[PDB]
Amino acid sequence: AVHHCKLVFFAEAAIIGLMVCGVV
Amino acid sequence: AVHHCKLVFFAEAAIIGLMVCGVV
Numbered sequence: 001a002v003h004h005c006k007l008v009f010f011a012e013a014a015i016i017g018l019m020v021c022g023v024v
Numbered sequence: 025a026v027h028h029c030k031l032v033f034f035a036e037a038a039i040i041g042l043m044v045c046g047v048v
């Protein structure tokens with residue numbers, strides 16, 4: 001099975017990049 | 025830098041695991 005990742009951004013005041021990965 | 029990751033779960037049954045990584 002394959003891993004998928006994507007960048008998600010959060011406002012904290014900079015904007016923080018976060019990597020979100022799941023197994024599709 | 026160093027990546028800090030953690031498991032997050034959405035109990036929706038069927039539980040959806042995801043991994044979230046930010047960089048320090």
Ligand SMILES: [Cl-]
Nearest residue numbers: 028030045046
């Ligand atoms: Cl974190």
